[PDB]
């Protein structure tokens, strides 16, 4: 029934502006107050702003006052967040949330949240990854099983997708979360475990896709003599 | 403002256990407290409102209590759908949140399989060297991975990444990547990762010799 | 003085 959809997120350089939107359906949006909340890995959940049903009263968190403007167009069922002078600390997932239903209460929380839209503030330029084999060897074997993989290094922004053998190989695959390097670029590895007796007779290829740079790589991972 | 102190930070529990999460407000908030559940990649979902009222569709095994400064969320019989992160929120003076409690699946100890991958020729051509050490399918999460280069302990030149608990067997996997320039890589012979884990009776070292692997 | 936690919905 009740649905909120955030949009407008993206990767932006610091100091620029960016407007988020939240489209509501399934309830009488024009009669409810609405919120923005954001979540970052090193600050938890942090309330950002609220706007009254009619657009009058707006309150803001101390960190965003002056820079952020909340607004709404009830004729379009849309909530807006205008973000200005974007700082690295504004990197977060941004959620919109509906106010709780009216009752005899004098204090009001939130009841339903949207899916969230990711905002990343960085000076890094778009760049496709280099893809390197993690070759199986006697130092990656255990009880008839061998591990092998690919290292997907130095790309920006997220995400990349990795598959194996064009999707025919899925069991035993672990693709790790990317890590942000001090260079400002991301890296990750994807590993799979396979029967070590297959190494001479089965081709293993990691298929890597980095849509932001339109980079596609098929890297055959060959066993070493180690 | 009002600070919410939630505890414990992480809790490992078996299915069917009795689980209790506490939150403490820095000043009185009457009953103006809500509890949320969040699973990876999804938005928080309201479970309890005004400290003790169950929201629509929330199962009866959830309960909340409290008034003033101390609040608790209890799951009487932990269900497989309940492993998730939980957050409290006061809504009497703006809206502030607890730091979160991750409820994780308890299972039997499994020692990691440890593997090591020298840098590829292709990467070396590019001017840098990455050495990867992989810990596969282990439990519990706590594990210590230390890089030694010519038996000299490394710090500040590695990064770790960890998966979420595997949907089948509830284990973790972890990678640690030591990164050096090609010049620094070539100054040293032995590259080793030393792994300490509860499942291992002693710490395990996997190593190779540069140029011999 | 205006309470941000007051009812933000239609009266």
Residue numbers in the entry:
A (entry chain A): 1 to 52, 52A, 53 to 82, 82A, 82B, 82C, 83 to 100, 100A, ...
B (entry chain B): 1 to 94, 96 to 214
C (entry chain C): 1 to 11
How is this structure described in the published paper?
As the most abundant surface protein expressed by Pf sporozoites and with essential roles in parasite development and invasion, Pf circumsporozoite protein (PfCSP) is a major target for biomedical interventions. In total, 22 antibody fragment (Fab)-antigen complex structures were solved at 1.54- to 2.95-Å resolution to gain insights into whether differences in potency are associated with different features of PfCSP repeat recognition.
The 10 mAbs that exhibited high affinity for the major repeat and varying degrees of cross-reactivity induced two distinct conformations in the antigen. All seven 1210-like mAbs contained a bulky Lys or Tyr residue six positions from the end of the HCDR3 (termed here position HCDR3(-6)) that directly occluded the MGG4-like conformation through steric hindrance. The presence of an HCDR3(-6) Lys/Tyr appeared to correlate with IGHJ gene usage because all seven 1210-like mAbs were encoded by IGHJ6∗02, where Tyr is the GL-encoded HCDR3(-6) residue40. For five of the seven 1210-like mAbs (Ky15.2, Ky15.3, Ky15.5, Ky15.7, and Ky15.8), this position was occupied by a Lys residue that formed a salt bridge with the Asp at the beginning of the N-core when DPNA was bound in this site. We also noted that 1210-like mAbs bind peptides derived from the PfCSP junction (KQPA and NPDP) with a preferred register that positions the major NANP repeat in the center of the epitope between the N- and C-core motifs. Specifically, we showed that the 1210-like binding mode confers stronger cross-reactivity and inhibitory efficacy than the MGG4-like configuration.
